[PDB]
């Protein structure tokens, strides 16, 4: 199958007869499910994203059915808005990014060109928007706030910025602010014709 990035790549998953909506997230090393009871031992862990860290419980060897595929591996449980299917399980069910083909065994980091500069950024199907670490871009910008861990984070919003990604030109909105990693979100992934596929 093929899954478009026009919208959030949400899929219903099932864990032990519990059915939950989850986001297919190439920007996530791990799978993070909203608070639920799971059987077995777990250990506390801290995971990072935009906004900071949240404390989760790490359960190993949890079966998760995803679009008719059986994944089994580590599931982190904690206070998240959206169930996130990360690369640990995506790789197991054979998910790839395509536009050529990019596998998910490693972080899907690519070189982009923006403002004459080369930067490394993460292809992130779990992000609506493209967010870069602090830099100077030419043009007007608007103050914007985006939702993070612990609350809203302040960013600068630049519109109609040319970005070259994997030999493809995009022109679109780039947010600049305190992200742990440069992320290419669905706004630009769609422009370069990226889809998720098994």
């Amino acid at each position: 199958p093929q899954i478009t990035l026009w919208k959030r790549p949400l899929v219903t998953i099932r864990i032990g007869g519990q059915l939950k909506e989850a986001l297919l997230n190439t920007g996530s090393d791990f799978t993070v499910l909203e608070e639920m009871n799971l059987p077995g031992k777990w250990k506390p862990k801290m995971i990072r994203g935009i906004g900071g860290f949240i404390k989760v419980r790490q359960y190993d060897q949890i079966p998760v059915e995803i679009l008719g595929h059986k994944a089994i591996g580590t599931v982190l449980v904690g206070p998240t808005p959206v169930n996130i299917i990360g690369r640990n399980l995506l790789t197991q069910i054979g998910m790839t990014l395509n536009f050529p083909q990019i596998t998910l065994w490693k972080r899907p980091l690519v070189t982009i060109r923006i403002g004459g500069q080369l930067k490394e950024a993460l292809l992130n199907t779990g992000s609506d928007d493209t967010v870069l670490e602090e830099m100077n871009l030419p043009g007007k910008w608007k103050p914007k706030m985006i939702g993070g861990i612990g609350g809203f984070i302040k960013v600068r919003q630049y519109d109609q910025i040319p970005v070259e990604i994997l030999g493809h030109k995009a022109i679109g909105t780039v947010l600049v602010g305190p992200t742990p990693v440069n992320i290419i979100g669905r706004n630009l992934l769609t422009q370069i014709g990226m889809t998720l596929n098994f």
Partner: peptide, 7 residues
């Protein structure tokens, strides 16, 4: 783990 989600 780095878990990058953004809305």
């Amino acid at each position: 783990a780095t878990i990058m989600m953004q809305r």
